[PDB]
Amino acid sequence: MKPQIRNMVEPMDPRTFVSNFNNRPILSGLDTVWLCCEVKTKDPSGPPLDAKIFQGKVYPKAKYHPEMRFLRWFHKWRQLHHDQEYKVTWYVSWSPCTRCANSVATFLAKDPKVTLTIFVARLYYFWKPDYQQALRILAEAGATMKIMNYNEFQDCWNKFVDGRGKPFKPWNNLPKHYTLLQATLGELLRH
């Protein structure tokens, strides 16, 4: 009898959630793309203000990348709400392209009342220069980036997936993939 984030969204299939990662090597193709976001105030102790899921089958074109959809939605949301300081969390399934990173950064500059934390499930094209730069572009703008570990997948399952009481069911390579991807992110950001 308390306000849950699950009630504030249209939750995704378990299948839409895990099909990209479950028993699939880091260097794979994709079935879906998603971005689960959460909005809070300065105080992390507070209750979650609002949340939304941007999902779709893979390879939308630039304009409909979940990151851009988020920016359109959150630009209006900021206007239809009290002005204070907000902290935004993303759980996003794929790597930001350069075009999304630039639009997000410019946003972060015009609206310093907002800080952004990004959890990425899997890096892609991390060997391509533009994708590496996109990560640095976001860090430069003050966005915080981390790879999703068990807790984050678990949390994202609890808040955003149609789980039906059922618990998060981790795949075997999840911590292995995490270590590899977290080290690679770290590397791309420093160098």
3-class SS string, 90-107:
EEECCCCCHHHHHHHHHH
Can you read off the two tokens belonging to residue 4? 């849950």
Look at residue 26 and give the partner it binds from a second copy, Zn ion, none, a contact being a CB closer than 5 to 8 Å depending on partner kind: a second copy
CA 89 – CA 132 distance, rounded (Å): 21
Number of residues that bind Zn ion (CB under 5 A): 4
Q: Is 82 annotated as a binding residue?
A: no
CA 101 – CA 6 distance, rounded (Å): 28
Helices 98-110 and 66-79: angle between axes, nearest 10 degrees: 20
CB proximity list for 187: less than 8 A, separation 6 or greater:
none
Q: How far is the CB of 102 from a second copy (least distance, A)?
A: 23
Q: Which is nearer to Zn ion, 8 or 103 (CB)?
A: 103
CA 22 – CA 174 distance, rounded (Å): 8
Residue 156 makes contact with Zn ion by CB under 5 A: no
Q: Is 140 annotated as a binding residue?
A: no
CA 143 – CA 92 distance, rounded (Å): 14
Q: Which is nearer to a second copy, 23 or 84 (CB)?
A: 23
Residues forming contacts to a second copy in the complex (CB under 8 A) are: 24-27, 126-127, 173, 175-184, 186-188
Interface region with Zn ion, contact rule CB under 5 A, candidates 34-42, 60-68, 109-117, 132-140: 60-68
Pairing of strands 86-92, 144-147: unpaired
Q: How far is the CB of 18 from a second copy (least distance, A)?
A: 17
Q: Are 156 and 118 in contact (CB under 8 A)?
A: no
Binding mask 81-120 for Zn ion (x = CB under 5 A): ----------------x--x--------------------
Q: How far is the CB of 92 from Zn ion (least distance, A)?
A: 10
Q: How far is the CB of 186 from a second copy (least distance, A)?
A: 6
Q: Is 65 annotated as a binding residue?
A: yes
Which residues are annotated as part of the binding site?
65, 67, 97, 100
Which residues are annotated as part of the binding site for Zn(2+)?
65, 67, 97, 100
